[PDB]
Design a protein around this ligand. Structure first.
Ligand code: HEM
Ligand code: MG
Ligand code: MG
Length: 86
């Protein structure tokens, strides 16, 4: 009864512009198209990562507990395991 959708990195890479702004962080896939102007760190750092694995950039910032919880509402799925960063 889990209802997780699994994506490949090629599928994520198709969603690579500000109007379909997806990225991967720690093997979770997020669609932040509706978050761009709500992000305290601005929209450009997020548009720069559209279609990519943004894990290292996200971690370099050291986001807070509240930012980590806020992210969950933008999760749309997870990477297929064979492409995961382990
Ligand atoms: C593309 C990956 C991301 C990058 C590069 C990024 C970058 C940044 C930057 C530069 C700041 C300003 C704070 C600082 O520089 O000290 C920031 C703050 C913040 N970001 Fe992001 N961010 C990313 C993804 C997200 C996501 C998905 C969320 C959640 C919905 C989020 C939520 C926040 C919040 C709430 C803050 C305020 C500080 C904190 O709570 O940690 N960010 N971000
Ligand atoms: Mg910059
Ligand atoms: Mg780009």
């Amino acid at each position: 009864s889990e209802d997780v959708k699994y994506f490949t990195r090629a599928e994520v890479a198709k969603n690579n512009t500000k109007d379909k702004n997806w990225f991967i962080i720690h093997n979770n896939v997020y669609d932040v198209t509706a978050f761009l102007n709500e992000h305290p760190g601005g929209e450009e750092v997020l548009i720069e990562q559209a279609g990519k694995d943004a894990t290292e950039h996200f971690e370099d910032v050291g986001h807070s507990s509240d930012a980590r919880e806020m992210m969950k509402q933008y999760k749309v799925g997870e990477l297929v395991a064979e492409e995961r960063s382990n």
